[PDB]
Scaffold this active site. Structure first.
Site, PDB file in Angstrom:
ATOM      1  N   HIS A   1       0.804  -1.220   0.000  1.00 15.20           N
ATOM      2  CA  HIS A   1       0.000   0.000   0.000  1.00 15.20           C
ATOM      3  C   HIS A   1       0.851   1.292   0.000  1.00 15.20           C
ATOM      4  O   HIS A   1       0.287   2.376  -0.097  1.00 15.20           O
ATOM      5  CB  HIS A   1      -1.080   0.021   1.099  1.00 15.20           C
ATOM      6  CG  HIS A   1      -0.572   0.186   2.494  1.00 15.20           C
ATOM      7  ND1 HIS A   1      -0.245   1.431   3.005  1.00 15.20           N
ATOM      8  CD2 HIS A   1      -0.443  -0.735   3.474  1.00 15.20           C
ATOM      9  CE1 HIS A   1       0.115   1.221   4.261  1.00 15.20           C
ATOM     10  NE2 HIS A   1       0.003  -0.066   4.593  1.00 15.20           N
TER      11      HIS A   1
ATOM     12  N   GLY B   1       2.393   6.188  10.442  1.00 21.10           N
ATOM     13  CA  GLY B   1       3.802   6.047  10.088  1.00 21.10           C
ATOM     14  C   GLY B   1       4.435   4.734  10.524  1.00 21.10           C
ATOM     15  O   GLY B   1       5.578   4.440  10.152  1.00 21.10           O
TER      16      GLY B   1
ATOM     17  N   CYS C   1       3.385   1.625   9.758  1.00 21.85           N
ATOM     18  CA  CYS C   1       3.204   0.563   8.759  1.00 21.85           C
ATOM     19  C   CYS C   1       4.555   0.043   8.295  1.00 21.85           C
ATOM     20  O   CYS C   1       5.475   0.836   8.116  1.00 21.85           O
ATOM     21  CB  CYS C   1       2.387   1.078   7.579  1.00 21.85           C
ATOM     22  SG  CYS C   1       0.667   1.439   7.974  1.00 21.85           S
TER      23      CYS C   1
HETATM   24  C1  LIG Z   1      -4.520   3.928   6.409  1.00 24.25           C
HETATM   25  C2  LIG Z   1      -4.254   2.420   6.588  1.00 24.25           C
HETATM   26  C3  LIG Z   1      -4.057   2.260   8.116  1.00 24.25           C
HETATM   27  O1  LIG Z   1      -4.857   1.625   8.787  1.00 24.25           O
HETATM   28  N1  LIG Z   1      -2.946   2.830   8.644  1.00 24.25           N
HETATM   29  C4  LIG Z   1      -2.538   2.720   9.999  1.00 24.25           C
HETATM   30  C5  LIG Z   1      -1.801   1.615  10.420  1.00 24.25           C
HETATM   31  N2  LIG Z   1      -1.444   1.406  11.694  1.00 24.25           N
HETATM   32  C6  LIG Z   1      -1.808   2.323  12.594  1.00 24.25           C
HETATM   33  C7  LIG Z   1      -2.524   3.469  12.300  1.00 24.25           C
HETATM   34  C8  LIG Z   1      -2.912   3.677  10.967  1.00 24.25           C
HETATM   35  C9  LIG Z   1      -3.758   4.869  10.576  1.00 24.25           C
HETATM   36  C10 LIG Z   1      -3.702   5.995  11.596  1.00 24.25           C
HETATM   37  C11 LIG Z   1      -3.926   5.462  12.996  1.00 24.25           C
HETATM   38  C12 LIG Z   1      -2.850   4.471  13.381  1.00 24.25           C
HETATM   39  C13 LIG Z   1      -3.008   2.024   5.771  1.00 24.25           C
HETATM   40  N3  LIG Z   1      -2.828   0.566   5.782  1.00 24.25           N
HETATM   41  S1  LIG Z   1      -3.911  -0.225   4.860  1.00 24.25           S
HETATM   42  O2  LIG Z   1      -3.825  -1.622   5.162  1.00 24.25           O
HETATM   43  O3  LIG Z   1      -3.725   0.194   3.504  1.00 24.25           O
HETATM   44  C14 LIG Z   1      -5.432   0.404   5.457  1.00 24.25           C
HETATM   45  C15 LIG Z   1      -6.566  -0.367   5.243  1.00 24.25           C
HETATM   46  C16 LIG Z   1      -7.788   0.086   5.701  1.00 24.25           C
HETATM   47  C17 LIG Z   1      -7.859   1.308   6.335  1.00 24.25           C
HETATM   48 CL1  LIG Z   1      -9.388   1.847   6.966  1.00 24.25          CL
HETATM   49  C18 LIG Z   1      -6.743   2.098   6.532  1.00 24.25           C
HETATM   50  C19 LIG Z   1      -5.490   1.637   6.130  1.00 24.25           C
END
Ligand SMILES: C[C@]1(C(=O)Nc2cncc3c2CCCC3)CNS(=O)(=O)c2ccc(Cl)cc21
Ligand SMILES: C[C@]1(C(=O)Nc2cncc3c2CCCC3)CNS(=O)(=O)c2ccc(Cl)cc21
Ligand SMILES: [Cl-]
Lengths: 305, 305
Positions: free
Chosen positions: B41, B143, B145
């Site tokens: 991603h 940040g 991830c």
């Molecule tokens: C935005 C992201 C995510 O969760 N990042 C993240 C990951 N870990 C912690 C934190 C966040 C965000 C802010 C708080 C804290 C990005 N990863 S993803 O698998 O593509 C995905 C998949 C679904 C959704 Cl609803 C968001 C995301």
């Protein structure tokens, strides 16, 4: 989001751990530049531990009696001296992995990471606090002596603890890196006991602010209190007195959540008089006191090293 | 003595953390030999997150679109490929700090250490478990991830988790190091929720054996249970079913303490019925499920108190 008991990354300390052997005793040493720091009781037999005269035991030792092993390499001891309850072994080789460091003495209530070691080999890392009674609730088996406690500030490792002994209640005692014990403890086989412990009030308050930041607000109420009334309450539950310094230190967390420190004190007063009533705070049924106000700010901001 | 939630020393993993940037997105990568592993991603914008076509987004990228930074050095990307939900960036330099490693896919109930990172810089280390619903209760901000989960039994690092997302309840989801998600989750902003979570029964039992080893027996009773009667009661408290595999795995702890697994199951049934009545077990007022039978053997003494 999320809130875990978090230790500092241990890598800078792992590169300093060595094995120190003298006679039949084997323990851990901290190798910084050309000196190895270890508990002075490495020179004692079980017979000596009863009433040791450390200078008299040390004068009978030569450099070659101390076996220092760094990984699979034998370091050559070229000098030795005692500073309080720590032995300093001058070695031929400077540790190429020596990080930027300081020796700091911490106060009760302050937290630090412990790198538990056996035979100069690191086995685990955990976070803990210096209790008001100067003991730590660690996890140490035979061979862990010489394991160190530390904090990391930017790129500098601040060494604050060196493990020496376990007390009859299963809690631990040790020194700063200058060999001065935390607490009224001595490095001898004699009757020693931990004093009555108290709860670190400023840390419980910080952890209540962390719960609010993470969405746990059931314990908040409309009430406020005075510092005098809260301390009269806290003293009855074996809580440490809260000072104006503690109130000032909680200022940033009070501004972020919009809950004044004496407003949060009224929540803690009600939690102390009524309990949790089947509820938890940050997955805990007890009021947690091993996160300082700075640990809470760091974990809810993402500070790196 | 003592029992702490203990993480593995993080040094071997710290030397692998890098920062990966693609356009406006910046996250963490794992540098092993000449490959950098990171969540795919990283190639998405927030506009691509509802229904990303990763294959179509990736075909439009060249090697020089991926910026990889290791400390203060820029690594040159010479190849790229996608494997499930992980992107593999071939770089021109092999990581000289690459430890001995394996990629392992874990099962629910297994524990591991997480090295939380931001901008390729490690900030903290904590221990956690793969919940029965395939989520982890981590501590991750924006940040983080690309941060990884691992175990270090002996001198080999077994990478088992890479962080990808936070679910609406504040819990976290990610993949193994081959890019396969744990749980029915997707790296897509879809309406997905964690299934109802349950308590890891075999781990609570292991932790009850740890309390007996450290010298505590107040919770034991004179009763026993059949495995099926235990499971009929356990499922009423949202506890995972205990299988014959779990009973076999608890064999060594059962032999060390002299308490049959089904007798320890009887104490657990009574603890669920009565609560703790003001008492604690290993400093906890809740039944702890994030220590496996293997973690208890690793941490605890071989001699019961
Ligand atoms: C935005 C992201 C995510 O969760 N990042 C993240 C990951 N870990 C912690 C934190 C966040 C965000 C802010 C708080 C804290 C990005 N990863 S993803 O698998 O593509 C995905 C998949 C679904 C959704 Cl609803 C968001 C995301
Ligand atoms: C034996 C030693 C000690 O506590 N080691 C140790 C340290 N940490 C944990 C464990 C032990 C031992 C067995 C249990 C587990 C040695 N250090 S000392 O300060 O000289 C001292 C002083 C007095 C006594 Cl009664 C013991 C010790
Ligand atoms: Cl597994």
């Amino acid at each position: 989001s999320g809130f875990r008991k978090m230790a500092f990354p241990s890598g800078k300390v792992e590169g300093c751990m060595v094995q120190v052997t003298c006679g039949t005793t084997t323990l851990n040493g901290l190798w910084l530049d050309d000196v190895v720091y270890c508990p002075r009781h490495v020179i004692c037999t079980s017979e000596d531990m009863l009433n040791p005269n450390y200078e008299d035991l040390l004068i009978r030792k030569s450099n070659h009696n101390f076996l220092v092993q760094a990984g699979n390499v034998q370091l050559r001891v070229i000098g030795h001296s005692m500073q309080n309850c720590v032995l300093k072994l001058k070695v031929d080789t400077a540790n190429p992995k020596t990080p930027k460091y300081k020796f700091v003495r911490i106060q009760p209530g302050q937290t630090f990471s412990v790198l538990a070691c056996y035979n100069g080999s690191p086995s685990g890392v955990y976070q803990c606090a210096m209790r008001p009674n100067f003991t730590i609730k660690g996890s140490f088996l035979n061979g862990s002596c010489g394991s160190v406690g530390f904090n990391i500030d930017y790129d500098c490792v601040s060494f604050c603890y060196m493990h020496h002994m376990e007390l009859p209640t299963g809690v631990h005692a040790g020194t700063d890196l200058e060999g001065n014990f935390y607490g009224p403890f001595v490095d001898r086989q004699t009757a020693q006991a931990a004093g009555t412990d108290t709860t670190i009030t400023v840390n419980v308050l910080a952890w209540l602010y962390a719960a609010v930041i993470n969405g746990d607000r059931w314990f908040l109420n409309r009430f406020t209190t005075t510092l005098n009334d809260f301390n009269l309450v806290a003293m009855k539950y074996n809580y440490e007195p809260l000072t104006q310094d503690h109130v000032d230190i909680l200022g940033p967390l009070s501004a972020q959540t919009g809950i004044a420190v004496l407003d949060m004190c009224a929540s803690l007063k009600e939690l102390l008089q009524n309990g949790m009533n089947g509820r938890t705070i940050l997955g805990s049924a007890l009021l947690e006191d091993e996160f300082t106000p700075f640990d809470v700010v760091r974990q809810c901001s993402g500070v790196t090293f």
